[PDB]
A paper describes a structure:
[name] is a bifunctional enzyme with an N-terminal lysine-2-oxoglutarate reductase ([name]) domain and a C-terminal saccharopine dehydrogenase (SDH) domain, which are homologous to Saccharomyces cerevisiae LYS1 and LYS9, respectively. The [name] domain itself consists of two lobes, both Rossman folds with a central beta-sheet with alpha helices on the outside. Moreover, [name] is a unique drug target for inborn errors of metabolism such as glutaric aciduria type 1 that arise from deficiencies downstream in the lysine degradation pathway.
Remarkably, NEM potently activated [name] activity. The activation was not only concentration-dependent but also time-dependent, consistent with a covalent modification. Alkylation of [name] by NEM paralleled the activation pattern. Using X-ray crystallography (see below), we identified Cys 414 as alkylated by NEM. We were able to model the NEM, which becomes N-ethylsuccinimide upon reaction with the cysteine, in the density and refine it with restraints for the sulfur-carbon bond. Interestingly, there are no obvious other differences between the apo and NEM structures. However, Cys 414 sits at the interface of the two lobes of the [name], suggesting it is an important location for regulating activity. Subsequently, we were able to identify biochemically that Cys 414 is a key residue in the activation of [name]. We provide evidence that [name] can be activated in vitro by alkylation of Cys 414 using NEM. This modification suggests a novel site of allosteric activation of the enzyme, although the mechanism is still unknown.
Numbering used by the authors: 24 to 110, 123 to 330, 340 to 358, 361 to 450
The structure:
């Protein structure tokens, strides 16, 4: 009846953990022994887990349940243990049980163990930092220059203070007037969209309805930034009669299109995309839409759309084919329909599509992930990869999450 948190080795930038010291304290209070594999890579220091009752050892063969952020590869995986991770044949010989956090879903079917809003919180900070660089490359110093990447801050609190400081400069009228008012569009309904809005709320922001973007993008107060939250009924219409039936779209999305390209996109400065996109879902923007959207000392912007940030890792933007890295976060989409990875001064739209956004705020990501995983840890400690799964007293959340 021993638990172990293994060290991450998949990536040099994987600084998260499946549990925080607060969760190790609660598990040790139940009487369970917790082993902590040493890791200079983790954002939360080893001694914080030791202060919470965790024992730090390099050998975790004593444990029955071994928790990790990503799946252990080849030799590191050993027999007669129960593992859990994100992401056959010889499983039965080695008698090991593998659990995938992604498969932990409730009766409704929505995932219970995720990273929550922190992909959106980090994405909003990154795209605000990216707009500062992109607008300066176009010849405009803005308060967005005083916002760094999400991983340059100890936590979201420190990042919020930087966003509020830059927002104060905007309220003082220090924005260049020639580029006009800035409009931000939030798509999607998940927690990542709410996390992006949480950062946006620290600016001198004003929320408007999607139909107001056309007027707001022309006459908006230059001491403010403007945002709108896009719902399905704002842009999805039937191909035949332009009617929106919410139940019909949820069953037959192939009967609908998106007027985002004509109704919203021409009046959008920055698009924060958190859309859940399936293969037969109407696309938000096509390649031809991008071609149409791109056509003295205080000059205006070449095009209204400055940048796009993908915070849900999800084909709705046709020309956002490739992904980016925390070290190289931004790329450009040229009017020649080419992807430029480092030419922020080039022609086009700034684009950001980092796949490990929560890893930029790994402390709070570890705590939020650990808060979701905590109510299922004890039943996973009592797991016996030797005994059959039917004998184990698993909740349907954990039982369905077993991939072996
Ligand atoms: C835990 C952390 C997080 O983002 N959520 C969603 C509100 C949780 O439940």
């Amino acid at each position: 009846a021993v638990l172990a948190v293994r060290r991450e080795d998949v990536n040099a930038w994987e600084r998260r953990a499946p549990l925080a010291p607060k969760h190790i304290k609660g598990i040790t209070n139940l009487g369970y022994k917790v082993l902590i594999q040493p890791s200079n890579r983790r954002a939360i220091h080893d001694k914080d887990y030791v202060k919470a009752g965790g024992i730090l050892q390099e050998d975790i063969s004593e444990a029955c349940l071994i928790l990790g952020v990503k799946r252990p590869p080849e030799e590191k995986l050993m027999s007669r243990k129960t593992y859990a991770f994100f992401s056959l044949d010889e499983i039965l010989k080695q008698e090991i049980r593998l659990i995938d956090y992604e498969k932990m879903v409730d009766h409704r079917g929505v995932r219970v163990v995720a990273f929550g809003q922190w992909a959106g919180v980090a994405g909003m900070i990154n795209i605000l930092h990216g707009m500062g660089l992109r607008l300066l490359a176009l010849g405009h110093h803005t308060p967005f220059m005083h916002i760094g990447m999400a991983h340059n801050y100890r936590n979201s609190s420190q990042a919020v203070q930087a966003v509020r400081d830059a927002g104060y400069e905007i309220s003082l009228g220090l924005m260049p007037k020639s580029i006009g008012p800035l409009t931000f569009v939030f798509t999607g309904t998940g927690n990542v969209s709410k996390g992006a809005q949480a950062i946006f709320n620290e600016l001198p922001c004003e929320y408007v309805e999607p139909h107001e973007l056309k007027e707001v993008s022309q006459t908006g107060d230059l001491r403010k930034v403007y945002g709108t939250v896009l719902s399905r009924h704002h842009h999805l219409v039937r191909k035949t009669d332009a009617v929106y039936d919410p139940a019909e779209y949820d069953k037959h999305p192939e009967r609908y299109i998106s007027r985002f390209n004509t109704d919203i996109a021409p009046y959008t400065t920055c698009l924060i995309n958190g859309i859940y996109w399936e293969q037969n879902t109407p696309r938000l923007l096509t390649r031809q839409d991008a071609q149409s959207l791109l056509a003295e000392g205080c000059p205006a912007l070449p095009h209204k759309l400055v940048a796009i940030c993908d915070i849900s890792a999800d084909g709705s933007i046709e020309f956002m084919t490739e992904c980016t890295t925390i070290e190289h976060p931004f790329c450009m989409y040229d009017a020649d329909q080419h992807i430029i990875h480092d030419s922020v001064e080039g022609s086009g739209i700034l684009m950001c599509s980092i796949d490990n956004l929560p890893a930029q705020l790994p402390i709070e990501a570890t705590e939020c992930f650990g808060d979701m995983l905590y109510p299922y840890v004890e039943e996973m400690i009592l797991s016996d990869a030797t005994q059959p799964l039917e004998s184990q007293n698993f909740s349907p959340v954990v039982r369905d999450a077993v991939i072996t």
